[PDB]
Design a protein around this ligand. Structure first.
Ligand SMILES: Cc1nc(=O)c2cc(CN(C)c3ccc(C(=O)N[C@@H](CCC(=O)O)C(=O)O)s3)ccc2[nH]1
Ligand SMILES: Cc1nc(=O)c2cc(CN(C)c3ccc(C(=O)N[C@@H](CCC(=O)O)C(=O)O)s3)ccc2[nH]1
Ligand SMILES: O=c1ccn([C@H]2C[C@H](O)[C@@H](COP(=O)(O)O)O2)c(=O)[nH]1
Ligand SMILES: O=c1ccn([C@H]2C[C@H](O)[C@@H](COP(=O)(O)O)O2)c(=O)[nH]1
Lengths: 278, 286
């Protein structure tokens, strides 16, 4: 019965107390461990939006709807006051290259720019996953992969979220994410919520109930200048997770809109300032 | 410090007790999401001891991957038959590969590791200079930028899976350097706990030993992450017998000479000392 958020807190504590101090691409220096795994229940409307520091729910949901549209145009997020892709995007202003939206919907197609019509090009992995869940739920290849060795050099930033896999049992849809690089302080809470939300959406349109989100980490790290803030965060007790309901019968994965999500009872501790490494 | 092999034994035990019973025609008992960690340090090599594992098959299959080969006949010539089932002309014709010759597994590991993105023709084609040589890329990044968080080799290729005799169970692996030590994490989407997993552990441990050697590092950990981790129902009696066996200290592995490039290893370069396993247990492949 231990709150699932303690998996996240325990890993931060372990990284700071036992991790490897190294340099890194950004020049900030990090403290890191290699290889971790967390499991978050998604059952009975439970939505694992972390509570010991406020997470950017609106950014999570808008970014994911943008992925689902297949968009690689950061201007569509900026227009919605979502600036999480700003650092890496000024090729035309806003064109992120063949990032998630494109890999999920067009893996293997040649990329031109964010305005190109890629209909019928590449593998639409997202629809492939939905079809397999509906038609052959015991399949062990229900995978969506964003790590494309051909395209990584054209991407504004190599994907941290290399691939995810789905699994069906007990009337439940589960999802596992392989995240190669995990900034425990800033990105990880958002990343948990992203793939928990994707699982809620796919479960909804496949007539399944959400089960578990399994979060596997490669290089799991704390930036050296985050330790003071995270030591303060570790003093905070998690609060019960919010609940998530989808307010209408959405027929297909592409039909979701932001207002379809009813997030109830989110009561996080206040935000903590933490500068993002560049 | 408990023997690392107990992670495998404990997971088999857990799956058989609480795993999900689901539906080939053989039943599976499965869990989703698991992770084991095997130390590779101080010459220790995690070749499981509660059932004799096919070490020579592990090493020859891995050398075959590294050559970029997708031709199962090259394994057969060395009396390694682990891919025979998936490459008979009859199997391939059954899968719809009517123009494919016996032995041709399609664009599987050797090809994805050395030529990701190239068009696949057949197993005899000269692919030199085509596609992404991910294996050499990893070696170069380890040498030149060891703190890089993108040291990845990916065999999961959505474009090519329809041409493969079997989609890769070993989707991708990632490397990590700290304190002079090279670690490796494998994401395995599908794990036959009884038959494939022991062999798969030894494969990626050996790969880590080889890459560490040619990058002048020491092996650290092998982290084995599983997606659908399952026990086939007709393995349960055999695995119940294995669970009563106590692990013995793992063997040691040394590389007998200085090998400069990953492509230069031969089986005789490996010295596996002290492997004293319990006997094989028959488990029929689904
Ligand atoms: C070093 C680094 N760490 C990261 O975690 C990271 C994450 C993203 C993308 N991403 C997945 C993000 C999620 C949340 C973000 C953010 O800036 N949130 C702040 C402020 C909230 C807001 O932007 O309004 C926060 O909530 O802490 S950015 C891009 C570059 C990165 N760079
Ligand atoms: C259902 C299935 N499970 C697997 O684990 C599997 C593994 C491979 C390839 N592979 C990675 C293998 C490793 C070991 C193997 C095997 O057949 N083992 C023998 C014992 C070793 C020997 O051949 O001497 C066995 O127990 O039958 S096969 C191919 C198809 C598969 N199919
Ligand atoms: O969704 C995201 C995007 C990025 N990062 C973090 C991980 C690293 O700290 C940095 C990306 O840098 P590289 O791993 O690519 O160097 O941002 C995340 O945690 N989650
Ligand atoms: O090296 C390998 C190759 C295959 N498998 C097992 C996993 C599954 O039981 C089966 C592959 O079947 P699918 O998951 O593709 O259905 O073989 C392994 O465990 N290891």
């Amino acid at each position: 019965m231990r709150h699932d958020e303690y998996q996240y807190l325990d890993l931060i504590r372990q990284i700071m107390r036992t991790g490897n101090r190294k340099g890194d691409r950004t020049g900030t220096g990090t403290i890191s461990m290699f290889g971790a795994q967390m499991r978050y229940s998604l059952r009975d409307g439970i939505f694992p939006l972390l509570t010991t520091k406020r997470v950017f729910w609106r950014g999570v949901a808008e970014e994911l709807l943008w992925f689902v549209r297949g968009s690689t145009n950061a201007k569509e997020l900026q227009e919605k006051d979502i600036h999480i892709w700003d650092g890496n995007s000024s090729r035309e202003e806003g064109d992120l290259g063949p990032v998630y939206g494109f890999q999920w919907r067009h893996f293997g197609a040649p990329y031109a720019d964010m305005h190109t019509d890629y209909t019928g090009q590449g593998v639409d992995q997202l629809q492939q996953v939905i079809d397999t869940i509906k038609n052959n739920p015991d399949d062990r290849r229900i995978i969506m992969c964003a790590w494309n060795p051909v395209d990584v050099p054209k991407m504004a930033l190599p994907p941290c979220h290399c691939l995810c896999q789905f699994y069906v049992a007990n009337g439940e849809l589960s999802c596992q994410l392989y995240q190669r690089s995990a900034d425990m302080g800033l990105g990880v809470p958002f990343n948990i919520a992203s793939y928990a939300l994707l699982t809620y959406m796919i479960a909804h349109v496949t007539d399944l109930k959400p089960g578990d989100f399994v979060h596997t980490l490669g290089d799991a790290h704390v930036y050296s200048n985050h330790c003071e803030a995270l030591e303060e965060q570790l003093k905070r007790e998690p609060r019960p997770f919010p609940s998530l309901k989808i307010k209408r019968k959405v027929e297909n994965i592409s039909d979701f809109k932001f207002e379809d999500f009813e997030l109830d009872g989110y009561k996080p501790h206040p935000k903590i300032k933490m500068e993002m490494a560049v």
